[model samples]
Target: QLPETILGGLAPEEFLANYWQKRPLLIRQALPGFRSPITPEELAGLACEEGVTARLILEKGGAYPWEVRYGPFEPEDFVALPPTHWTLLVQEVDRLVPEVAALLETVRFVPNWRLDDIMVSYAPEGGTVGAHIDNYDVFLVQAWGRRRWQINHRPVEREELVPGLEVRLLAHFEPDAEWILEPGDVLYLPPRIPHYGVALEDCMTFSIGFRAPDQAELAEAMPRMAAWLDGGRRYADPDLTPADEPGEITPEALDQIQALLRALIDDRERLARWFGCIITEPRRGLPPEPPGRPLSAKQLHRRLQQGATLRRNAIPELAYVRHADGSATLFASGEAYELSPELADVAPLLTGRRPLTAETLRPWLERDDFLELLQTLIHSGILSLIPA
Candidate 1:
């Protein structure tokens, strides 16, 4: 059950129906007495690390207006930075920090597949990123310090943006509603809501962003969809008639081609498989690193029984969809695992719920089939052994 403060006392269903994608919500003390899991220095440290997506935004004092700097930044870069009017942001911090990832547990009312990442942004006093609209849904949690948020709640187009800048700042921003948020306050903004935030003091905001795949993103998997189709299918019409005009494409031929295309692309099973793989795919440059030595089934079980906990790896994304036949398809880091009908119940557990101990998993431990599945996950680095 969720705390009454989290959703402002609204049930999950009510929040979904009322505010999700349709409106904005400002919940006071959503994370009651929430303390920042990481400090500004630590966040800056992440910006300097290789393969991390980080950025420094300056509201002034750049060659260009509201200049942006991409990182792997140097310590000297921060040292030279002005005291105020600047923001440092790091993407996918949850992937590298366990405590940051733990914050996601609060938003489990939303499905795992729709979750993108927890982006943490730290700003000094007077820091502002300008007014802008995001294409995806985001919940901005005030992790530390204070920030004043403003939203116009109007659906604006990209054409209205200021030209010749790396960041999209709305050329015209007139906020209709505004609020000054303190620590633990949460503001949920749906996609296309024009909004801006400025730090009242040195503060960090945790943006829990969600994925909303566009048409092109989904169409990128078109080539892979062919792998599931009949290998030898050719475009042919058994019933062909001579056209009245040789240059004119006959309606019958057009109809035949349309039917052929539908036949090739209209299978729910194939679509589900493609979506499973695409959605669970890890972020670019962040791949799963399996354990150096594979643990045998016996060793794994013994360790589990000896009071070691099994922790799911935070690097890779995991999700699953069940079939009507009681089987389930588990997707992990762009790969799909087809669980047998008998193992349908285990799919959700593998997707990540806590306390995966011998005491909790006792029912399935003795079965060799279950052990083999567990062993494969361990070998693949999807799960790790944590000594008690």
Candidate 2:
């Protein structure tokens, strides 16, 4: 079971300083009086709904697992199953359920910026996902019934067992620890830790995952932003002289174009700036609002000082502004901002998950430049009023 300490005992700073990305921690009975929030039947019911993402993995004996992706299936579709065993995963319940979202505030030890999504999995008797490794960090909370988890600390080697599955299963695993998790038990695992769990009884687990961007993602993101900095530099075959005939470009010209591409990558500062912005921004999901309805200076100053809080649906990421060279530049979403620096100090408060009151924002509240910049955030739908 998830322990009370896992849910309430430690402060965010303590969890971050101690367990986060460092090692695994097992907490027993974390959710006190935690009735299974949603039942197995309910989860299966939700899994069948349209727009509800789900995956069914069937591992009968030693047969290669049969995987099925199900979505937007109606509730009536699942009621006919003679289910002795199966696993149902429901995605994005936090967006609809306030209680699950509230549960997120408890894990502030992990930076909210890296937090990706919350998924709940319900397993019936004999249900299990075959041995596998995830490339991202996850906190698995056993919210109902019993689940026995076998975990290994051994280094992982990947091999493809199937033709279509993009994920790799562990080739070798040696268990060092094992436990039967009851309701309220929590287990934290770092990226690539090999683990497998079997439902001793019907059980539900909440897996909170963090984003881990790969090299290919970086290659795509960095260059796209760098091109933004390149000021629309186009591929030009400058070295091409009248190559004896028309419509024929020489190999030398192609090499020159490749060299130009290499030159752009050789600029370290530009690459670093792009990295800083993207890595710092929120990794999961998009902001809720679209650009429109700009806020007035009075409204901006009032909201900041009146203890209003910014939300994920509004800002969705961390941002910092620094004053330099007669302007303020915002740093966020793996990019740099070149806006007015007058909002620098206040930027931290805005980016952080805290309520700011007018008194706290009084200094910035008095500045015209700060107010103007805040209005821009309002117009971008990056800031909004929190209800009393």
Candidate 3:
């Protein structure tokens, strides 16, 4: 059974406006009757499956923990049963479980685009990673058993507990708040807040983290995408304005290249649209579709008239691309489609929770360019035919 807060009915937009990134929120007993969805035994089974990512950290005799990363580990690895404890971390398992993915909707405060990863951690008694901080926001859901958490607001002073560790240790931390979270208790932590957890018993935590891209990364991607739009433009130096020496490159040529790059960024509308589309692409691990031929225009038209909705398998990431020329764009990874203003009427279908069908998309279907773009999306697995 789903929790009341989830199934009891709150809209996605409402959650976004109210809770997302504004401040920390603790929802106690959020998932009543919640069971540990994945157990250590099940986790081990998943680890053996090809393409599954898993890591086992064993803290034997307290020497720097030994890690067995991304398993298909041999059976011999877990043969020994030492008193010293261990922990298992698994990633991207949500795509395999509908229930786990549904949980994401429960905390809709943050924008869907920032959602980076969902990770599950299972720990035995005395299992811990010591004190640490994450670079992005995380909602730590206690799935089972009780785990004590010591969290404090971000501190200005940085002190090193272990010299070589990348994370800065908190110099002075006042445990202003502490909680022993049971199943369904959620503890939200903003980025860079120092926190540590120790399990009183066996435990599991589902961490939903947001991706925070730095300025440097956007700087790199925007230019590459812009260059693609500019007819594959590349830095050019013509020999017509050659220097006296063959090996010499003039300062003017370098300045011209810089100027061209600067001009691309100076156009705010172009930069914004590019950034919006790039950031909205779904984070990795989207399942591939089964092979099939593309649908014909007549078949597509018939299906739309019959009210066939698009499948979720198609278009994992849905976005609205507002363009400066009184038009909108639809960006799905490497594919970009210019949407007609007439089709903009159905922009809600692309951006909102309500599922849409061919009949529903009919208003935009009359335009040839719009229909062609839709066909491209279907061919690229960004749209799928739904049953009538």
Candidate 4:
């Protein structure tokens, strides 16, 4: 059941119908008794590590106004920064920290693929990201201290960002609503809302962001459809007539072209295939490299028999689409696999959050296909082992 506290006392159905993407809702004590599992010093330390996507934004006291610096930063860099007016943001904290990732379990109402990373940001008093619009939805949970959030709930139709700025800041922002968020308070902002947050004191905000792939992205990544075009119908009009002018393309021809492309794009099966693959594409530094040595199906089964637990890797972007024809395609970290007939009904086990051991999946232990699937996922690094 969806928690009412997460949606400001609204049921899942009500939240979706009324406010899911239409407006914002401020949920007080969304995570009751919530305390940060991470600290500012730890966040800074993470920012200094290689391959971590971190950003230090300074509204002032930099070579450029509202200056932004990417990491890996030196410890001295944080030491040199001004006490206030600067914010440090670390992306994919959920992938790096298990406790932080646990926060995602509450928002499972949103499909797993639509959920993005938890970007944790730390700031002292006066820190602000400035008023800007996000293309995707986000839940800003005040994890530590206090932050005053100002938002213009109405759509910012003309999203004019300040020119010559390191970060995207609205040139004109007149917030219609405001609130001071405390620890455990959550402010849910749907896409395209112009909002600004400033630290009232030393504070940290965990931004639980959602992924919304635009139509352009979907079009660009539309794979496998190319093969369909090879044996497909060609554009040959039965009722053909010469153009009114030699150089002019008639409206009739354009209409036919539009219909032809629309039919291809509207193929439900093909669209699902494309979306499954695209949505599961791993973010940077994810689906960690496959194991150094591949594990054979027999070896994997033996390990399971010996009591090793199979745990999913961090940033588990795993999901599947079941077809009307009683088949399913399981998408894991950008790749798709057709589930065997017997495994289709039990596919949830593959993506379940809980670690799986031999005792937990005894029924499937003797199935060679299931063992093979486990072997494939383990070798792909989507699943890893905890030694017994």
Candidate 5:
């Protein structure tokens, strides 16, 4: 409820209730005068980093061109690119540049856990990724230039292209509507909306995408959920009855075994824990600030009293779930921090994507519980010190 001006002057609840995952919303001038701190040159330089996820989408000169290639691209690759048909994209750019990462705060209304990384794409005139559907929501914020966006509400009976291609695209596409976006224009696209953007001029777009896992991801997540199970008690069926055909597993016996598994798979507690970890876990190579030597509680309090700020670690998705018993579990990285009911007030400052100031936490420093918890987080590198 800080300010809804960025979201068409509507509250987060209003935006979600009306438009999220249902339709597209275009908010003109969402970040007025928006200009990326990094340029196309900076982007290409980043694509050189071994840990970076970069791609070059080269559209063959045709009606529907969707050719693509991955990259740890050398300078020669960018120099060799044709002007009109290729797009250079760098994913998780927020991690590569702290200035660009601050864009996350502009859209803090969405839960941090649901947030994915900021993907920055630079494309020349006529460059596009082709028409495709995405399973997650995205906020396309035009940053450096202009592009035209074509959108369709949902998948249509457009002739499907055969599976397995670098760029998965529909053979046919019909746009429900189209708009050309300039720097500062914003487009909010819901899940599975078939959309495509073509650069009008040399342009850069910052895609603030969400982290939505499909069923296949859940299948993988089962391993983590299953890990929470106490001690090695293999599936036991004292209820096993004699099967009419001993050689063939009876349907009833098979179903009984399935029931046990399905219950664990669908357990409310287990599913909650598993999802917290999933949404909070950063991609490989991203962890909280390295374990730092923490100041003593008194020393830390003194430092803060002078001028020091607690910074959220590089691990971007910081979120938590509160239990019925009035305690909450905050998921920072692959770890969890248990907070008693008394510290509930402090949880938001840590999880909330906002600037942390000493005056903002004047009251909490008076409590030992708050100081102790803060010290542990600082030492663990879950939180970092910003020397004032």
Candidate 6:
């Protein structure tokens, strides 16, 4: 139902064409009357769990030496807190809270694969993260209380902030505009825009962030892509001329070697496959599943007719790319699943965040390959059954 004006009353297409990655837009009461899915107390409890990535920042003393603590915090740590200048930050709340995950459904305008996760932050009075910029797009929604935000009109590529700090805060930040966001209000900021938020009171904010590949990420994936390109091939100077100087590395030889390497990297087909694998690399990778009972097509069909729908595992990333030949390949957390040319709809049906129902899947029940593909996905744990 996106383009339904979730973004300051503008359609998704409109927002993407206009404001997205171009400039920031502050939506007043974008989620009018909205309440937080989880309270700060509950978040503090989650912070105590070893599995959770939690952090606390205390703006004590001068800002230059702000105290930052990573948490698998003991209960007493929060109980003893003075609270006024401290904040609790929790990551991957969407996986932990159903209500929080539901909010992601509203913004279906963006591809689900691009979703990173929902991170919630609770801050008491005077709590701030300092003037900083993120490398990805973020929708900062006020769930409870109020937060004052100051952002620059145009983002800067350089910073003069103190070095070596965990938070790369801007030393000198000039505000282009400012807004005090209350509950239900949302402010969207694209990557690299400088902004800062400070809680006015005890406030909770939901950050729906999108994934963007970092330059480091691209470089890291290069070796794998190179490996995939037949690494055994060596530079063949089939028509070699004896060099004028015995030890001379001729320009012709250099050009051929450079061209050979370029040719491998420049292969569009290989590039697409490499990118597909990279994009489908799990953001929060699910641990590998142990071997399960092999599923048959008939069994899956029976389950489907009995109203068992397939739910894509949230922890894994998925994406599909169609080839000119009419077939497509669905990349699931770095694994590839091929779709027959006849079943183009399978791409959207499988990759969608919403589960697909039997009634909706009835039309394709007779497709053995599709059902077999479904069986493979389930057995692979990329897709799972909703137990009765």
Best by TM-score: 1
Residue-level lDDT tens digits of model 5 in 40-128: 99999999887778988878743345666687778787786776978988998887677787777777777777788899999998888
- Model 6 per-residue lDDT tens digits across residues 52-167: 78888877643446678887799988877665877888887776665786677667778766778888999989887788888888999999989999999787887677767776
Off by over 4 Å in 2: 1-23, 29-52, 58-65, 95-98, 160-174, 230-273, 276-309, 314-316, 319-339, 357-362, 366-384
Candidate 5 achieves a global lDDT of 0.78
Q: Native-vs-model 2 lDDT?
A: 0.64
Higher lDDT: candidate 3 or 6?
6
Strongest candidate by lDDT: 1
lDDT of 1 by residue, 147-225 (tens): 9999977766554988878898888888899999998899999999999899999999999889988889878767766
Question: Please, what are the lDDT tens digits per residue for candidate 4 over residues 1-388?
Answer: 2233365566777788888899998988887778789999999988887788998888898887888898888989889888899999999888777688778777767777888789999999999888889988999999999999999889866778888786788988898999999998999999999998999999999999999888787777765566435756578878877656878777887988898888887888776766777787877764555778878788878887898888756444778888878778888888888876677854666665545888778888888887877888888877776688
Tell me the deviation in Å of residue 330 in model 6.
Answer: 0.4
The weakest ten consecutive residues by lDDT in model 5 span: 1-10
The predicted structure with the larger TM-score, 2 or 3, is 3
Tell me the TM-score of model 3. Answer: 0.74
Q: Which structure is stronger by lDDT: 2 or 3?
A: 3
Q: TM-score for each prediction?
A: 0.92, 0.71, 0.74, 0.86, 0.87, 0.87
lDDT of 3: 0.65
Ranking by TM-score: 1, 5, 6, 4, 3, 2
For model 2 the TM-score comes to: 0.71
Candidate 1 backbone clash number? 0
User: Which sections of candidate 3 miss by over 4 Å?
Assistant: 1-23, 36-39, 61-68, 72-84, 155-161, 164-174, 231-258, 280-317, 345-347, 357-388
Q: Indicate whether candidate 2 or candidate 6 has the larger TM-score.
A: 6
lDDT value, candidate 4, whole model: 0.82
CA lDDT, every prediction?
0.83, 0.64, 0.65, 0.82, 0.78, 0.78
